[PDB]
Structures are given as C-alpha cells and as structure tokens.
C-alpha cells in the first residue's frame, strides 16, 4: 500500500554483502528525484543514511551505499556488521502526491549466531489473584534463538485450547529471544485439576513445565 | 550586540548609489528599511502552485523582506539606510523564470538612462541553471557600468552549472558560516569553484522579518551572502562614485580575509579553483597594482583540444600559465583576439585535458605586447626579450609541439617562448626564484610586501612539472630538483 | 547542537481533538522547511504533513485530509499539528523532521528528526493495572521470582525491583496485547535461594497514563 | 547557422516558451517585424503563437510561447543568433 516498494525482510551473517531494492514509478523517482535512505534501530527515531540516491552524512560508514537507476533505487552494505539489524526506509517525493513519501520498510535480519534452547520458567495463579476470583498461569521463555517458538498448553495430558495469549517473540538486550503466555482459568478449572502444563517446543525439541494447585 | 556577520565583514582599522532588489515582495513598512526603498511597480512572476499554496497563510514579503534588510537596514543592515528599489521576478513560493527576470534586467537598463547617472548596485539573489541569454544579458549590463551581485547557489555543486552564478562579469558570492567555514544548507550547502568570485557571512544572518514591522529573524543561504557584498558594494560606491566595476571586483578581492577557509570541505578537483577569500570593506575611503588569477574551464580530453582564460575588458593580461593534473600537456601561449590578449593553453595528445590560467591586473595607461621567438636547438634553449625601451617583461609563456623534451624569458631548446611586456608610466618589475631539490609536491615563491605578482613559471628542463599558478602574490609550481620563478612588479 | 522536541501527545477518544508542538533548537529555524511522519506500533514510516520555512508551500497525505491542520511560528521556533476528527488509525509516534528549503528547486532528505510523541485514539479509557506476587518456588543456587501486571491500558508501564537498587538478573517481558484490548506483563528477578526469607523484594510497578504507582512485596509461599 | 538551448536541468526546464535572440545590432523595429513573421508563418501551419514581449536595450530578441514544434521554424527566421527555452529561477 506504500507508493514505493520494498522487500519486507532481507538477511545475511556478518561479514556478507546484502541489498535492500526501492521501486517507483515516474511520478516519483522516474521523475528526477532523488531517493534517500533512514536506519531506524528498535526503539529509536529513524535517522538519515544515505541523501541524494548515494551520498553518506557524516558519520556513517562506506560499508553503505546507494544507487538509483531509473524507476528504482537501492541500498548495499558490505561488511554486514550485528549493528546494523534494523529497519531501512527509502523515501522520493511525488509529484502527484506532492509529499515525500517512503518506502515499506525492510528489516534487515543479522544470522549466523550459535542455537540457544529457550529457558521456561512457569507460575501457578497467586493465592490473591484466586481470592479475586481469577486464576492465569503464566509461561516465561527467555533465552532462545532463533526466534520461533511454538507453545502448547495441557490440563492434566489434554490439549488447552482456550484462554490462551501468547506474545510474539522479542530480541533481549542480550540478542537472544524472549516470549511469554498465559491461561486464562476460572479458579474453579485450576483447583479441579492435578496439574497444567507449559511445552514450549523450538528447532523440534520440546521443553515442558509443570505446577499443581496442590 | 553586534550581529557576528556584520562585525566579520568590519576590518580591523576601520567613510548618490541605488541598490536594486530583484526578488520576491517586500514588507516596504518595516522600520529597518521604510523610506529608504522603493517599490518599484514592476513584476513578472508565474502562478504558484496552487495544489500547496494557503494564501491566508503565506508570507510572500519574507525572503525579499529579510534580503532588503541585510543590505540596507538602519540597526542590522551593511549600508545602513542605503537607498533601494525592488523589482518582484519570485512569486511567493520564491520561484521565478529566466523569461520574466530578463524583462526585469531590461527595465533597470531603462530606469539606469532616463535618471541621472550614478552608480548602481545590482543584486540577484536567485539561480536556475546555466543560461546563454541570461548570461548575455548580464553581461551587457556590466559593460554598461552597472556592478551585478548574485547568490553561487546553494546545492555544494559547481557553480558554473548556474545562471546568473557563472556570468564572469557578475560578482558571485558563496556563504561562509561563523567559523568561517562552507555553510552547509540540509545536506548541500553553498556552491564553490572557479565562478565563485569570494565567499560571505551566509548563516546564521540576522534581517528584518515581515512578521511585523520591528520584527526580525534569522536566515541562511547564499542570498544572504551575496546581500552582504551587495551592501559593501554599494558602500565602496558611496565613497567613490567614479569606482568602475573591474576596480571595484579587484578591490574586493584584495582586501577580503585570505586562506581562512578549510578547503578540504570542497571537493579535491575544486580546491585550486575555489577561491580562499571572505569579504570583508576596504578598511579605507581610498594607489598600488591590483591583479587577481582566472582559471578557465577545463579543455576536455581530445588532442587537439585548448582551453582559454580571459580578462575583463578593462583590464591587462600580464602573464599567462597551464596546468594538468596528469602532467600531459604542451604548455601555454597569449594569443590576440578582437584586439585584446587572451590565454589558450594546449593539451597533450595523450592528455585528459588542461587549464589557461590568466593573470589579469589594472594598469592605467598601460600599452602591453606579446613578442614570440620559434624553437631553436641551442645550448642556451629558446629566449626572447622586450626590446623596446621602457617597455617591462611581466610575464612568460611557452608552447611546445612535440610531447618528449633583465627582461628575458628562456624556454626550452624545442618550445616557442612567449613574452608579456607592458609600457606604463612608472611600472617596475623584477625576478624572484626559488628552487628545492626534493620537490615534495609544490614549489613556491612570493613577492616581498608591496609587491604584486604578475608572473609565475617553473624553469625549464623538468619532467615532472603539472603546471604553475598564483594564488594571491605567491607563485605556485606543481610537481608530480625544481624551481619556481615569479614576477613581481609595482608602481612608483 | 541541533534538536527537536515534539509534545502534546496523549490518549483521546475517536471524533477528539489533539494538538502537538514541536520545539526547534540549535539551528537557522526560519531557513528550514519542517515535516510530520507518523508511525503505528510496529508499522512503517508514513508522511503526513509539509510546511516549508515560510508556509508558502503546505500540503497533507490524502488519509489526514481536512482533519489535521499544519503551522509554523518561526518567531517561536516552533511546528504544529492540530488532529482534528481523529481516529483509531491514527494511533501512531508522530516524529517531526527538518529538511532546508530550497523552494521546490530541490528536494532534500530530511536530515533531522525528533524523538517522538505518542498519540493513542481509542473508545477505551485509561486504567491502571491489578499487581500480583508471583513467589518463588519451595526449593540450593538461585530461584525465580516476580510480579504479574495485569488489565491495563495504554502502555507503557515501568517495573523496577527494590526501587532501583535491584538490577541484576531482572528481566522484563514485553507484554501481552488481551482480546479485551487491555495489556498484561511480568517482571521477573533470577536471585539467590539462600537470600530468600531474609532479603525482602519488592516490585515497584509505575503506569503514568493512569496516574498509579504500585508496590508489591514478593515473599516465599 | 542559429542553434537552440535548454536547461540541463530538466525539472527546472519550462518548454513551451522561449526567447528568441537575434543578432546583434538587430534594430527595434526588425525584431518587432520578425516577431510578426514567425506568427504569421506559424499561423499558416495551424497553430497560435503569443508575442509576449519585444526585447530593445539589453537583448534585440522576443519573448514567444508557442508549440516545441515550431522550433525549426523559428530557427530559419532572418537575424536569429539563436533560440533558447524558458527555465525556471529560485530563491537562494
Ligand atoms: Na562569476
């Protein structure tokens, strides 16, 4: 739905070339003007990286650089770096639109770091939280990469559908991945069981964890 | 208390002309500027585009407003209360065309003769790209004695891509911050190179806002630069009605702060061409030897091809000089063209191109020649001398056509040798050189105090010789055991 | 050095009104053309509106047409942006940006921006979270402990452990968005099992938007 | 022979109007009379021309918006030094 096109996600270890490509049209960088390029880290405001198709502020490495050609533009990084996994946006203005709009948006993915198994640690409902007539159970994965995890929920050895939110899973400060879920019980369904268990299964090998009301 | 830009221009011993404005309106109320301009009536201007213009919401007076104030306010102008009148060529989105800012140049020519005859100041502070005609139509108005000021641009590119920026006769002006550094403008800045005739305060400049009538505001760009000069001229005018444009550009260039820039923040390829100068007023009313050095363009790489410097009319070219950054060339020559002397440097055939580099000076009464001597296949190379008694040597060039090789020039046993001499009550010149075994790079030599430069050359018999140049009164010999040799002269 | 500081952000219903600033500093403000990008948690950069450096050039992206309205006080070295009829779409971080004016000759990058003010639309009001011990396990090396953050709306809210004083080995998870459209997380503390019973630990739980600070001690079952 | 010219920037070019510059020494009333030449010519082939100004001081030349069309037809005219395009000029 962006006026200019970007893949959605490109990758590469450290050390590896990648590309991130920007296509227009010719009310925009068809028409002569120029195609410039933002870095924006997690949770950060995007700043300039590349301006007029190839020039670099101050500041930024000539590990970046920036072409356009026709109704397209594009951006390398040589020597890919753990620094630079972040969100890249070009931006042309359009005459048409008479705005300087952006890309998409393309977050550049850093591989090649070692498998982590998920720590799980997982709480039984407070004894507070039951007097105020409610009961969650609550799953914390930590610790993992990469970053996909699936997460089962059993009341005794039968499948919990219901009442469960999981989060999608989030890099650390540490850049490993981190997730969390959580059964929703009525007070009534936690103390009618033996047990509820927790299995977080990541790469094909499941961790399980288990609390009783007991 | 004093704006940081107006104290800059102010040297350290530290004093009837019209200014003309073309621009965008002006607030002509605001107490810096109100009873000293005039609104003219004329205006030639396109639509906006009214897909982004909220009339309600515009201020179509501010640029012209503010520009107006640098050059003439009563508290932060130049020429404080300098006499003024504005011509509208920008609409409110501060855009014009070449078309209509033509029309306006033709109107001062208009006013300039049915009023009595006075200096005038022209400023221009706008650019589009280059243009022949209005190129053309500045210059007809310079030779008309009218002093035209302009902006380089602002886009840190050549400015010699820029109307009216690279009309030679028009003085350009390039914007210089508190540091006396290159502004930077977003991520471009003000333009550089050969066209760009001295840099000014550009940033950071503080004018009359037509927000309201004691109001004012602060404002970057080249615009601002070239309203600086624009005041200074019209200062130096003030002062000396009879001042000719040549004078007067030769005066600004003398007396502006040398070498206070970091050239290294224009790109390697322009540093040579740019000059290091930042305006400043004559700290004086009011006799000596101006010159200044003019590159040419670039000769582009055919075999045959030439590059040529020129001065302005009411100048002499005392010397003439080549220069290649690859060391492949075939040296320099003063030719006669409609009567005036100009420089045409030649290319090497396996050369990527040359520059002519002029040396161009006001000499009152001055009668010069070139006289040439062939090639010759002697011990004592090539040499020519100025016969004629009174008659001082100022400059020597050589050409050669082969690619493998008091008061007189020596060339080279297989090069033709050019030499400048001038009759001019008064004028003496001599020799100065200087040589250094381990050429590090350059070789140079400058003339004592009270001296100008007029010539500068490297002596014969080197292989790695790139070329040779003045900046200001040093000569300047590129090597890729060398000497550099200059001449100076005065008048008593 | 050159900043800006945009404000004024905040939570408001659909159909309200809101209007944000944005403070300019350090540089030639009156030279500059200045910009409006929003972003949607987790979504990409969208231009909204343009105010060149003496508003004679003005224009909005189609979806905020006729609903917000852009201006300039250069006098004031301030932009803002008034968000009328506003919508749950136009939840996002409104950055204002910079770019010089080179009146339509050029169009640079906009090569400074802000940090950002959130702006949240919602029919939903603001409510402050239900704190819950999450206590350590009946178990020597190091156990696991925290609290859980229940029921609240809008984000954020802060955790500390000890009111600052505990820092190693907290960690806490991002949180869950409900089906009811109110958020949940947990703070957790890896400590010692030997310091269990004669260290006390105490979450302290921040939400601003809702005015409420909680503290909860968290003690062995 | 008389050549023609345009912005290098192409954004900044305006076709569709140009300035008509004739030789030098040109009188008023010979521009004057060209410019009326090359409406009358133009006309002839089907298409209107505006005469916008009549250059005397500075330039001897014309101010013509008129079809890209027509610039080979313009360029044949008596006295023309050459042709160029109107471009756009900014505030700096
Ligand atoms: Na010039």
Redesign the interface.
Known sequence: ESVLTQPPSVSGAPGQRVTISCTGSSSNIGAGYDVHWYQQLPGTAPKLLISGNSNRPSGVPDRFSGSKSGTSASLAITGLQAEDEADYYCQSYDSSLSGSVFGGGTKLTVLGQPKAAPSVTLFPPSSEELQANKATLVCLISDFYPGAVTVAWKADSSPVKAGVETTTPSKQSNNKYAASSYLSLTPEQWKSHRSYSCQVTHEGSTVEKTVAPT | SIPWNLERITPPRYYLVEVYLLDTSIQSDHREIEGRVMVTDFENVPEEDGTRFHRQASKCDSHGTHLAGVVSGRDAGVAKGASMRSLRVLNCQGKGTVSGTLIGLEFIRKSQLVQPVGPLVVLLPLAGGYSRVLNAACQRLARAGVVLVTAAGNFRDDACLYSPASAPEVITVGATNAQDQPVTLGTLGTNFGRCVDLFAPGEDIIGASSDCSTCFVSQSGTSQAAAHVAGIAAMMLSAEPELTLAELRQRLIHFSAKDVINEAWFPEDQRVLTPNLVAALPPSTHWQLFCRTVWSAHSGPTRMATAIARCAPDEELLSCSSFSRSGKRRGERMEAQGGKLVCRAHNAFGGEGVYAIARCCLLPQAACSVHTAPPAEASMGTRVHCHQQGHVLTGCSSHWEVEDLPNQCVGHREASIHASCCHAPGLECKVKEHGIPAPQGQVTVACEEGWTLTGCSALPGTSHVLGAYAVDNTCVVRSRAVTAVAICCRSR | EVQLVESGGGLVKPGGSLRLSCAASGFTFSSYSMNWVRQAPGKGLEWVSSISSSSSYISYADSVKGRFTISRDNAKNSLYLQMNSLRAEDTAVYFCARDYDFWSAYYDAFDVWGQGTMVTVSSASTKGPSVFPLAPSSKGGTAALGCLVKDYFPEPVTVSWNSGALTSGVHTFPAVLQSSGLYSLSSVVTVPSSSLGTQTYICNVNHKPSNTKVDKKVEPK | TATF?R??????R?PG?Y?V?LKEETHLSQSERTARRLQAQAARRGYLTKI??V?H???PGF?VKMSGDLLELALKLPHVD?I?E???????
């Open positions: 010219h912005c290098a920037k192409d954004p900044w305006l109007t300035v510059v916008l100004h250059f001081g500075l330039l101010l050459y160029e109107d471009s756009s000029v900014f505030a700096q």
